[PDB]
């Protein structure tokens, strides 16, 4: 993997994708509550998805970038993407 020498190739590979999505939406240019009663996946859940260990600052930055994605105009591809990182909340 081209990001091997970062030490967090999977965390930074994901932050590469979401930052590239954000750029295309901002360049290219409705209600954002497509999903309700949902939460962002907790740090323990994210670590499992990436199969690596993260810090608290690493988790916080990932969420801030994902929030920025929702703010921008989102095609169905973006909504499916952010969905993968949303866990259904049971009230």
């Amino acid at each position: 993997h081209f990001l091997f020498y970062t030490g967090k190739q999977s965390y930074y590979s994901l932050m590469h994708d979401v930052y590239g999505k954000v750029m295309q939406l901002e360049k290219h240019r409705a209600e954002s509550r497509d999903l309700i009663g949902s939460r962002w996946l907790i740090k323990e859940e994210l670590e499992e998805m990436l199969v690596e260990k993260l810090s608290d600052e690493d988790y916080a930055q990932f969420i801030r970038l994902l929030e920025k994605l929702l703010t921008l105009p989102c095609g169905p591809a973006e909504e499916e993407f952010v969905q993968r990182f949303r866990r259904s909340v049971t009230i």
């Binding site: 932050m15 979401v18 930052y19 954000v22 930055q61 801030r64 970038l65 920025k68």
Partner: protein, 86 residues
């Protein structure tokens, strides 16, 4: 003593606001340095002591004014992150 009375250090009360006039007179005396001068004339400051205080206050004013410039200068870059995520 030989000057005219009620011209120097005199303020006029507006609409019976005697507290507002007193607050103005104090800022005038504080700004002209009379308050500090009267404070330090209660006891005698030795000439060597006076010189040490003035050299320290001058250097403190230089480094303070310079630190203000550095914060104001570096606060222009203080804005929302443009490269969030990288």
């Amino acid at each position: 003593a030989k000057h005219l009375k009620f011209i120097a250090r005199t303020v006029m009360v507006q609409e019976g606001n005697v507290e507002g006039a007193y607050r103005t007179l104090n800022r005038i005396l504080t700004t002209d340095g009379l308050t500090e001068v009267i404070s330090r004339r209660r006891y005698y400051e030795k000439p060597c002591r006076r010189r040490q205080r003035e050299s320290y206050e001058t250097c403190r004013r230089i480094y303070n004014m310079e630190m203000a410039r550095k914060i104001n200068f570096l606060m222009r870059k203080n804005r929302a992150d443009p490269w969030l995520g990288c």
